[PDB]
């Protein structure tokens, strides 16, 4: 009986296994934009995907997951909140079955289609898991999808996903470039939280950008043909895999922009 998405292992049951759960800078929260205040002090973001090694699509049975070559410092998010470097390691998405949900993060409560996390560590700490047991140990760039026209970068990543359409299967996925999954504007909020998914760790610092990407119609339904199951198990098909808003108790959220 492990965690999922459904009715008897979903966000609700969680706590049981994972009691930080119901902790004090819990993730996603939705995003208040008149309560959200500038922040002057914030530095400017800078996002240095130019030298990314992607290796992997993995479908690891809750999403699936790009996997980077972390071994350097090539794929670098730095600035805004931050202090430090915090390397690109992974990214992937929550979607919804239907358009109107699927984000973890809403905005003034309004959920998007689907969102995207590039998870990052803080080179502080040497590798991912003594980052993940640090207050400070991962950035999340999250990035929300709307339904509307295709976003062309994204067209590699839908197109080997019948290459994985059950859990534990992996596709080579070398010299995709993240670049191409950015919006325009780097406009962000930014607040501290957590993992939106088992082991729930108080590690992130969230940087939400309030601009979208537009994805096809045709684009989100590949995603949704994704399976949570294995090969030759009975077929539940990978939607929902979303965590809802948490309480944003003793916080505050900051925006980069006026
Ligand atoms: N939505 S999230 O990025 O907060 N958490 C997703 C995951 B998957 B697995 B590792 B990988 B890294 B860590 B565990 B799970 B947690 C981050 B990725
Ligand atoms: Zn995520």
Same mark, same amino acid.
Not at 149 to 157: D, N
Not at 243 to 248: I, M, S
């Given at each position: 009986? !492990? *965690? #999922?998405?459904?009715?008897?292992? +979903?966000? $609700? %049951?969680?706590?049981?296994?994972?009691?930080? @759960?119901?902790?004090?800078?819990?993730?996603?929260?939705?995003?208040?934009?008149?309560?959200?205040?500038?922040?002057?002090?914030?530095?400017?973001?800078?996002?240095?995907?130019?030298?990314?090694?992607?290796?992997?699509?993995?479908?690891?049975?809750?999403?699936?997951?790009?996997?980077?070559?972390?071994?350097?410092?090539?794929?670098?998010?730095?600035?805004?909140?931050?202090?430090?470097?915090?390397?690109?390691?992974?990214?992937?998405? !929550? *979607? #919804?079955?239907?358009?109107?949900? +699927?984000? $973890? %993060?809403?905005?003034?409560?309004?959920?998007? @289609?689907?969102?995207?996390?590039?998870?990052?560590?803080?080179?502080?700490?040497?590798?991912?898991?003594?980052?993940?047991?640090?207050?400070?140990?991962?950035?999340?760039?999250?990035?929300?999808?709307?339904?509307?026209?295709?976003?062309?970068?994204?067209?590699?990543?839908?197109?080997?996903?019948?290459?994985?359409?059950?859990?534990?299967?992996?596709?080579?996925?070398?010299?995709?470039?993240?670049?191409?999954?950015?919006?325009?504007?780097?406009?962000?909020?930014?607040?501290?939280?957590?993992?939106?998914?088992?082991?729930?760790?108080?590690?992130?610092?969230?940087?939400?950008?309030?601009?979208?990407?537009?994805?096809?119609?045709?684009?989100?339904?590949?995603?949704?043909?994704?399976?949570?199951?294995?090969?030759?198990?009975?077929?539940?098909?990978?939607?929902?895999?979303?965590?809802?808003?948490?309480?944003?108790?003793?916080?505050?959220?900051?925006?980069?922009?006026?």
């Amino acid at each position: 009986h !492990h *965690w #999922g998405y459904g009715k008897h292992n +979903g966000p $609700e %049951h969680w706590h049981k296994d994972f009691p930080i @759960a119901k902790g004090e800078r819990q993730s996603p929260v939705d995003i208040d934009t008149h309560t959200a205040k500038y922040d002057p002090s914030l530095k400017p973001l800078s996002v240095s995907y130019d030298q990314a090694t992607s290796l992997r699509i993995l479908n690891n049975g809750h999403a699936f997951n790009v996997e980077f070559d972390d071994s350097q410092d090539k794929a670098v998010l730095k600035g805004g909140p931050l202090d430090g470097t915090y390397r690109l390691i992974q990214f992937h998405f !929550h *979607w #919804g079955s239907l358009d109107g949900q +699927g984000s $973890e %993060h809403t905005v003034d409560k309004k959920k998007y @289609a689907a969102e995207l996390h590039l998870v990052h560590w803080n080179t502080k700490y040497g590798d991912f898991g003594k980052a993940v047991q640090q207050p400070d140990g991962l950035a999340v760039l999250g990035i929300f999808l709307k339904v509307g026209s295709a976003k062309p970068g994204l067209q590699k990543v839908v197109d080997v996903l019948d290459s994985i359409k059950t859990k534990g299967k992996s596709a080579d996925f070398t010299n995709f470039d993240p670049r191409g999954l950015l919006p325009e504007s780097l406009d962000y909020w930014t607040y501290p939280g957590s993992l939106t998914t088992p082991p729930l760790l108080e590690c992130v610092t969230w940087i939400v950008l309030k601009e979208p990407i537009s994805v096809s119609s045709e684009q989100v339904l590949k995603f949704r043909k994704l399976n949570f199951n294995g090969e030759g198990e009975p077929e539940e098909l990978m939607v929902d895999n979303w965590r809802p808003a948490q309480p944003l108790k003793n916080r505050q959220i900051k925006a980069s922009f006026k």
